[PDB]
Enzyme design. Structure first.
Site, PDB file in Angstrom:
ATOM      1  N   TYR A  45      58.859  -0.984  54.103  1.00 35.36           N
ATOM      2  CA  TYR A  45      59.873  -0.512  53.057  1.00 35.36           C
ATOM      3  C   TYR A  45      59.825  -1.419  51.753  1.00 35.36           C
ATOM      4  CZ  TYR A  45      62.848  -4.550  54.400  1.00 35.36           C
ATOM      5  OH  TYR A  45      63.291  -5.743  54.717  1.00 35.36           O
ATOM      6  N   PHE A  55      65.053  -6.342  45.683  1.00 34.58           N
ATOM      7  CA  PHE A  55      65.917  -7.207  46.795  1.00 34.58           C
ATOM      8  C   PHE A  55      64.829  -7.479  47.921  1.00 34.58           C
ATOM      9  CE2 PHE A  55      68.150  -3.149  47.865  1.00 34.58           C
ATOM     10  CZ  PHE A  55      67.964  -3.078  48.887  1.00 34.58           C
ATOM     11  N   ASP A  56      63.887  -6.691  48.328  1.00 33.91           N
ATOM     12  CA  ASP A  56      63.076  -7.023  49.433  1.00 33.91           C
ATOM     13  C   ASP A  56      61.965  -6.092  49.602  1.00 33.91           C
ATOM     14  OD1 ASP A  56      62.298  -8.842  51.386  1.00 33.91           O
ATOM     15  OD2 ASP A  56      63.217  -7.573  52.841  1.00 33.91           O
ATOM     16  N   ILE A  75      71.576  -0.614  58.535  1.00 34.77           N
ATOM     17  CA  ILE A  75      72.760   0.140  57.852  1.00 34.77           C
ATOM     18  C   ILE A  75      72.568   1.807  58.026  1.00 34.77           C
ATOM     19  CG2 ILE A  75      73.049  -1.437  55.778  1.00 34.77           C
ATOM     20  CD1 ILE A  75      71.056   0.771  54.247  1.00 34.77           C
ATOM     21  N   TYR A 101      76.161  -1.121  52.363  1.00 40.64           N
ATOM     22  CA  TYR A 101      77.032  -2.513  52.414  1.00 40.64           C
ATOM     23  C   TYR A 101      78.382  -2.523  52.168  1.00 40.64           C
ATOM     24  CZ  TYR A 101      72.426  -4.275  54.012  1.00 40.64           C
ATOM     25  OH  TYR A 101      71.121  -4.595  54.338  1.00 40.64           O
ATOM     26  N   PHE A 118      65.644   2.898  48.842  1.00 37.77           N
ATOM     27  CA  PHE A 118      64.677   2.557  49.681  1.00 37.77           C
ATOM     28  C   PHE A 118      63.431   3.297  49.429  1.00 37.77           C
ATOM     29  CE2 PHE A 118      68.293   0.543  51.585  1.00 37.77           C
ATOM     30  CZ  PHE A 118      67.592  -0.961  51.906  1.00 37.77           C
TER      31      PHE A 118
END
Ligand SMILES: CCC(C)(C)C(=O)C(=O)N1CCCC[C@H]1C(=O)O[C@H](CCc1ccc(OC)c(OC)c1)c1cccc(OCC(=O)O)c1
Length: 128
Positions: A45, A55-56, A75, A101, A118
């Site tokens: 991902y 962010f990642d 999540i 979140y 995502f």
């Protein structure tokens, strides 16, 4: 950019039909089967805020991300979204904060009230 395209074209995959989790199938996968509750799933991902801020990414680690589906280990948008995917599928998910979140965020990388984008590739899945 890609997040706005999901806003515009995504399929609403929420049971409530509240546009909380919208999905574009970018690459159709193979086989009829989708992963079931408790399966071990393997994905790659990339995650960004809806404004495009990364962010990642599991690709950066050369490390597939592994979790048990449908158990609240990730999540809400991921348990909902990955259950709709076929092996080899790549999708884009746009997730309103109530399916991500929420008020708490995942600080500091994810603020309160954040919509998340995502890219997810479903590599494999296996019964427990
Ligand atoms: C800060 C952003 C991170 C956590 C790096 C990220 O990219 C991310 O956002 N994720 C990682 C890949 C799966 C989706 C997502 C994720 O769910 O991470 C979850 C965040 C925690 C969480 C679990 C269940 C929830 O609801 C039932 C929940 O709701 C707020 C939060 C996560 C799961 C497992 C490991 C993990 O981080 C690595 C670690 O702790 O070792 C993060």
């Amino acid at each position: 950019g890609a997040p706005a395209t999901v806003t515009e074209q995504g399929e609403d995959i929420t049971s409530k039909k509240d546009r909380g989790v919208l999905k574009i199938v970018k690459r159709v996968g193979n086989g009829e089967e989708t992963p079931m509750i408790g399966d071990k799933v393997y994905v790659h991902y990339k995650g960004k805020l809806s404004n495009g801020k990364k962010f990642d990414s599991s690709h950066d680690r050369n490390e597939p991300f592994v979790f048990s589906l449908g158990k609240g280990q990730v999540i809400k948008a991921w348990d909902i979204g990955v259950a709709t995917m076929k092996k080899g599928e790549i999708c884009h998910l746009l997730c309103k904060p109530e399916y991500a979140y929420g008020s708490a965020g995942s600080l500091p990388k994810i603020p309160s009230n954040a919509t998340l984008f995502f890219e997810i590739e479903l590599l494999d899945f296996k019964g427990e």
